[PDB]
Design an enzyme around this catalytic site. Structure first.
Site, PDB file in Angstrom:
ATOM      1  N   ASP A 138       0.840  -1.193   0.000  1.00 18.42           N
ATOM      2  CA  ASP A 138       0.000   0.000   0.000  1.00 18.42           C
ATOM      3  C   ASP A 138       0.872   1.239   0.000  1.00 18.42           C
ATOM      4  O   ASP A 138       0.611   2.207   0.718  1.00 18.42           O
ATOM      5  CB  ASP A 138      -0.939  -0.007   1.230  1.00 18.42           C
ATOM      6  CG  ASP A 138      -2.205   0.788   1.001  1.00 18.42           C
ATOM      7  OD1 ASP A 138      -2.597   0.942  -0.188  1.00 18.42           O
ATOM      8  OD2 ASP A 138      -2.799   1.255   2.007  1.00 18.42           O
ATOM      9  N   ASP A 188       1.441   3.715   7.154  1.00 20.82           N
ATOM     10  CA  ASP A 188       0.471   2.648   7.169  1.00 20.82           C
ATOM     11  C   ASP A 188       1.121   1.433   6.579  1.00 20.82           C
ATOM     12  O   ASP A 188       2.282   1.477   6.183  1.00 20.82           O
ATOM     13  CB  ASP A 188      -0.771   3.032   6.370  1.00 20.82           C
ATOM     14  CG  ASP A 188      -1.937   2.096   6.621  1.00 20.82           C
ATOM     15  OD1 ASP A 188      -1.888   1.319   7.597  1.00 20.82           O
ATOM     16  OD2 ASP A 188      -2.909   2.122   5.836  1.00 20.82           O
ATOM     17  N   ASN A 219       0.159   7.514   2.520  1.00 17.68           N
ATOM     18  CA  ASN A 219       0.806   6.671   3.526  1.00 17.68           C
ATOM     19  C   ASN A 219       2.225   7.158   3.787  1.00 17.68           C
ATOM     20  O   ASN A 219       2.974   6.573   4.580  1.00 17.68           O
ATOM     21  CB  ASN A 219       0.835   5.199   3.061  1.00 17.68           C
ATOM     22  CG  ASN A 219      -0.549   4.561   3.011  1.00 17.68           C
ATOM     23  OD1 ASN A 219      -1.480   4.959   3.736  1.00 17.68           O
ATOM     24  ND2 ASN A 219      -0.694   3.550   2.165  1.00 17.68           N
ATOM     25  N   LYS A 250       1.680   4.384  -0.947  1.00 18.62           N
ATOM     26  CA  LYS A 250       1.046   5.509  -1.593  1.00 18.62           C
ATOM     27  C   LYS A 250       1.383   6.790  -0.821  1.00 18.62           C
ATOM     28  O   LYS A 250       1.745   6.726   0.359  1.00 18.62           O
ATOM     29  CB  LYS A 250      -0.457   5.277  -1.652  1.00 18.62           C
TER      30      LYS A 250
END
Length: 282
Positions: A124, A145, A129, A126
């Protein structure tokens, strides 16, 4: 692995810092110490991923302070990272260069290299994050995250596809399984945006948008990329490679001149990058 009968008895919640698939990061305050924390809530092997995450220690990765269980619910209490979103803080800057982007990417790469050494794939990776640790100008960025194993699950994969398709790797979109390469792709994409301010994939039509990503059809468009070194582009191309095998690993990206040598330009590209960031990420 702390236990709690009710998670509302430990933490009071405010609002979502960033949703995922089976997961929702919400900001919370510790009821009996008043500490603001980020709480990754999950409800349904993966507890091994989370275990390892609790042992994750890296300056550029959010510390998973601890984990709470409530019967049928896990709450990953992450260090709250309030320096701001990557792109938000790039916009706020005055002097923004390839060197800045290179120093930003190095941090994500080194952090991702760390995760990969420990066999944990972000999944994830991104900009939402990627947050600054502090409001300070020189602040380190944090991976804030994680994509947990149950992001590899095809339901989550298609949800990832429907969310912001731009940050997800060609393979993942192809319903091909996640790998460490997936993260490197996303670092490439982040790199790309750090240097121009816009997604490498940006069609108004969804089908065309996926087509671009699947076929890694992106360009270093003028005028935006003109003052970006070939080194920086070379770096992105090798991260943003559709073939995950051909794609550079964290080490390979970390050993790349734009990251390890002195090839990142000192040219201020803020005006254009922030101009493009505002036009895309409000």
């Amino acid at each position: 692995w702390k236990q709690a009968e009710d998670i509302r008895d430990i933490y009071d919640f405010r609002d979502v810092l960033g949703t995922g698939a089976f997961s929702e990061v919400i900001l919370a305050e510790d009821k009996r110490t008043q500490k603001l924390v980020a709480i990754k809530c999950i409800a349904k092997s993966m507890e091994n991923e989370i275990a390892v995450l609790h042992k994750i220690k890296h300056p550029n990765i959010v510390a998973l302070d601890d984990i709470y269980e409530s019967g049928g619910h896990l709450y990953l209490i992450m260090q709250l990272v309030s320096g701001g979103e990557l792109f938000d803080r790039i916009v706020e800057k005055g002097f923004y260069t390839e060197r800045d982007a290179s120093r930003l990417i190095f941090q994500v790469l080194d952090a991702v290299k760390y995760l990969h050494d420990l066999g944990i794939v972000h999944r994830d990776l991104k900009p939402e994050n990627l947050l600054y640790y502090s409001l300070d100008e020189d602040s380190k960025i944090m991976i804030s995250d994680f994509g947990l194993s149950k992001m590899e699950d095809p339901g989550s994969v298609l949800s990832t596809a429907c969310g912001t398709p731009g940050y997800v790797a060609p393979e993942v979109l192809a319903q091909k399984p996640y790998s460490k390469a997936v993260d490197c792709w996303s670092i490439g994409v982040i790199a790309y945006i750090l240097l121009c301010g816009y997604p490498p994939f940006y069609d108004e039509n969804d089908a065309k948008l996926f087509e671009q990503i699947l076929k890694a059809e992106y360009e270093f468009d003028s005028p935006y990329w003109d003052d970006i070194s070939d080194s920086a582009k070379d770096f992105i191309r090798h991260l943003m490679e559709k073939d995950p095998e051909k794609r550079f690993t964290c080490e390979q990206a970390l050993q790349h001149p734009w990251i390890a040598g002195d090839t990142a330009l000192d040219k201020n590209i803020h005006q254009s990058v922030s101009e493009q960031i505002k036009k895309n990420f409000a």
